[PDB]
Design a protein around this ligand. Structure first.
Ligand SMILES: *[C@@H]1O[C@H](CO)[C@@H](O[C@@H]2O[C@H](CO)[C@@H](O[C@@H]3O[C@H](CO)[C@@H](O)[C@H](O)[C@@H]3O)[C@H](O)[C@H]2NC(C)=O)[C@H](O)[C@H]1NC(C)=O
Ligand SMILES: *[C@@H]1O[C@H](CO)[C@@H](O[C@@H]2O[C@H](CO)[C@@H](O)[C@H](O)[C@H]2NC(C)=O)[C@H](O)[C@H]1NC(C)=O
Ligand SMILES: *[C@@H]1O[C@H](CO)[C@@H](O)[C@H](O[C@@H]2O[C@@H](C)[C@@H](O)[C@@H](O)[C@@H]2O)[C@H]1NC(C)=O
Ligand SMILES: [Cl-]
Ligand SMILES: [Zn+2]
Ligand SMILES: [Zn+2]
Ligand SMILES: [Zn+2]
Ligand SMILES: [Zn+2]
Lengths: 257, 259, 109
């Protein structure tokens, strides 16, 4: 059985959310591979299948429970279990298709969506962009129930896609970025729901490119600038890893030191 | 193994000035200096971070005059200079160190035209550098315990309810100083290394070790020379005391630069 | 909610104050105008003492019993005052964070 981390929205606090995101990071990578003080996720090359994934069990006030599966090599959600049904995003290639056969083996119903789990396709299926899909404890609660009832005929596809968009940002992206995690802790702290601002959106969009720029930097200095956004629309460029150290908590593996 | 690129970039440091080959003269032995950051293609401020641990301007090398504290740093032909005098390491905490001497690049004064030197490393503001093409410090809010905002009030610093107040804006300079947006001559300062010393705002004049800070990957704001971090005293904002304190990681030591 | 207890003895004595909570998320501190005496972070690991009482007072906490302590050794007539317990938390208010007090316990030395 793959490692499991639990979070509940019932009575969730700043602290309980922080313990949860910390716990997820502790099982995503060992922390022994660090570039310019930023941890690196395990190399897909060499990673045995029995260490490929981690499980995140979510529950809410109604004690509906759902289990997301995260690829440790990129911290992203590849599918989820609800009751005795399991669903998976369309894998990109054949090996990822084979690797997910090792998830939720006990489950009696297994399905692969025709769509992948990238934001662009989830947004069109949800009928809305991340910039308008509110985040917070409340949205996570509702996303959990919608995911649970999808096995039942009670969750339409846009609401499912919207629930995926909520869970991925609040779990995977918060794991990748202390910045995004702090944005989620802001919402939990004040019991507010809020769509992410452009700084969050551009960070999510740039995660791969940021990982490559940092790992192939010459002593922290990038070969090319990466364009980010402030919380207002305003754009700025980053030429060095120094400002990103408190912003990014995990990087996808790109190359050897 | 990852590719090692060779980016051309400015080196910004004390008071936000740029590392500059004086008067654009590339005669062997001409001094390196602080100078206001240019906005053109002039070679004397654009440095190539080479794969051999060399830092080059217009084909010539950033070179230390010697291996003793206080000697100046010059431009010199890379093949003719002593090889060890042309080698540098750029550390992630803003230090540019000469490995042979273990001495650190420094600007012992803050004025334009200051001759650069190598000094003993004390992680002072005068030894903080950033390789970047950005010539402006990044202005940001600094959120901390309970989502409250770091706030400047003349000499005093504390944490208070956030409201998008210029007293809550901070300029992160390339030399590692954290400056109140309303007066960039002044610096977030710990007058000393003792634990529980109250952090305040004072002139950036001395460019001391107590004035240099690094945002760590764990969310703490670290004063590099002491090894202590910023801390909302007793985790109680009403005390209006931000102190140096050994790292325990609890929420009163967690911060986030909300840009 | 917070309630004090354990509050007369001569100069140089000892007394331990308790603080029973109703509901670990909270930083806790002791006060005695009201002045800071001692404080401790939520998980522990950070204890911060006022200069007057440093080296004489010991704040402790125990989050599985939801009780805060203040050990007061080598007391002086200067310690005589009303001693309150205080907690700070993450919610919303005009402060921007929560402050829950106690009803106070009298100490006379
Ligand atoms: C920071 O700003 C400076 C100045 O604007 C940039 O320097 C310029 O960098 C470009 C590309 O790296 C250089 O052009 C290149 O020239 C080589 C040699 O001929 C050629 O093979 C390439 O195809 C490319 O055209 C350009 O010469 C250089 N300008 C200078 C040194 O005055 C620098 O790239 C910026 N750094 C970053 C990380 O964005
Ligand atoms: C600033 O960064 C440098 C470079 O990462 C640090 O020096 C290294 O620290 C590690 C951890 O103790 C040692 O294993 C290395 O031997 C050190 N040297 C090098 C060349 O890597 C330095 O400690 C940092 N300074 C502070 C105050 O954090
Ligand atoms: C989430 O809940 C389950 C069931 O209550 C716990 O078993 C998990 O504990 C974790 O997994 C077990 C097998 C063991 O390794 C334990 O040390 C782990 O902590 C729990 N997950 C977490 C992260 O607490
Ligand atoms: Cl330096
Ligand atoms: Zn580095
Ligand atoms: Zn297919
Ligand atoms: Zn978009
Ligand atoms: Zn000359």
């Amino acid at each position: 059985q793959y490692p499991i981390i639990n979070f509940t929205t019932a009575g969730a606090t700043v602290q309980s959310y922080t313990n949860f995101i910390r716990a997820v990071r502790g099982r995503l990578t060992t922390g022994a591979d660090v570039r310019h003080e930023i941890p690196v996720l395990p190399n897909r090359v060499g990673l045995p299948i029995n260490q490929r994934f981690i499980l995140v069990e979510l529950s809410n006030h109604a004690e509906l429970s759902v289990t997301l599966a995260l690829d440790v090599t990129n911290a992203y959600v590849v599918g989820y279990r609800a009751g005795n049904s399991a669903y998976f995003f369309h894998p990109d290639n054949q090996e990822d298709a084979e690797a997910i056969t090792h998830l939720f083996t006990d489950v009696q119903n297994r399905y692969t969506f025709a769509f992948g789990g990238n934001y662009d396709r989830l947004e069109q299926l949800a009928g809305n962009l991340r910039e308008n899909i509110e985040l917070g404890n409340g949205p996570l609660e509702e996303a959990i129930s919608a995911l649970y009832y999808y096995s039942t005929g009670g969750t339409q596809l846009p609401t499912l896609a919207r629930s995926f968009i909520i869970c991925i940002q609040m779990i995977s992206e918060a794991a990748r970025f202390q910045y995004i995690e702090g944005e989620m802790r802001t919402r939990i702290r004040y019991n507010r729901r809020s769509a992410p601002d452009p700084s969050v959106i551009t960070l999510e969009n740039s995660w791969g490119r940021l990982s490559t720029a940092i790992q192939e930097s010459n002593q922290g200095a990038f070969a090319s600038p990466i364009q980010l956004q402030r919380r207002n629309g305003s754009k700025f460029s980053v030429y060095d890893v120094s400002i990103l150290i408190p912003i990014i908590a995990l990087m996808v593996y790109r190359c050897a030191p | 193994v990852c590719m090692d690129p060779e980016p051309i970039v400015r080196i910004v440091g004390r008071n936000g000035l740029c590392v500059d080959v004086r008067d654009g003269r590339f005669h062997n032995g001409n001094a390196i200096q602080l100078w206001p950051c240019k906005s053109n293609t002039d070679a004397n401020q654009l440095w190539t971070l080479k794969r051999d641990n060399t830092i080059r301007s217009n084909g010539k090398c950033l070179t230390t005059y010697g291996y003793s504290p206080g000697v100046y740093v010059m431009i010199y032909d890379c093949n003719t200079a002593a090889t060890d005098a042309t080698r540098w390491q750029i550390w992630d905490n803003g230090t540019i160190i000469n490995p042979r001497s273990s001495l650190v690049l420094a600007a012992t004064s803050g004025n334009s035209g200051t001759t650069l030197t190598v000094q003993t490393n004390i992680y002072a503001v005068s030894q903080g550098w950033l390789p970047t093409n950005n010539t402006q410090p990044f202005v940001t809010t600094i959120v901390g315990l309970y989502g409250l905002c770091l706030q400047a009030n003349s000499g005093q610093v504390w944490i208070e309810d956030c409201s998008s107040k210029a007293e809550q804006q901070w300029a992160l300079y390339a030399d590692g100083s954290i400056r109140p947006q309303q007066n960039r001559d002044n610096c977030l300062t710990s007058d000393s290394n003792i634990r529980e010393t109250v952090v305040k705002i004072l002139s950036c004049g001395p460019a001391s070790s107590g004035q240099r800070w690094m945002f760590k990957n764990d969310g703490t704001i670290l004063n590099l020379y002491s090894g202590l971090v910023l801390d909302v005293r007793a985790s109680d904002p009403s005390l209006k005391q931000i102190i140096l304190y050994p790292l325990h990681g609890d929420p009163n030591q967690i911060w986030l630069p909300l840009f | 909610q917070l309630a004090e207890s354990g509050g007369l003895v001569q100069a140089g004595g000892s007394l331990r104050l308790s603080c029973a909570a109703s509901g670990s998320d909270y930083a806790m501190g002791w006060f005695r105008e009201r002045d800071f005496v001692a404080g401790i972070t939520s998980s522990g690991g950070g204890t911060y003492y006022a200069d007057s009482v440093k080296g004489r007072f010991t704040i402790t906490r125990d989050n599985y019993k939801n009780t805060l302590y203040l050990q007061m050794d080598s007391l002086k007539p200067e310690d005589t005052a009303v001693y309150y317990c205080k907690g700070t938390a993450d919610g919303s208010s005009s402060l921007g964070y929560l402050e829950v007090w106690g009803q106070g316990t009298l100490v006379t030395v």
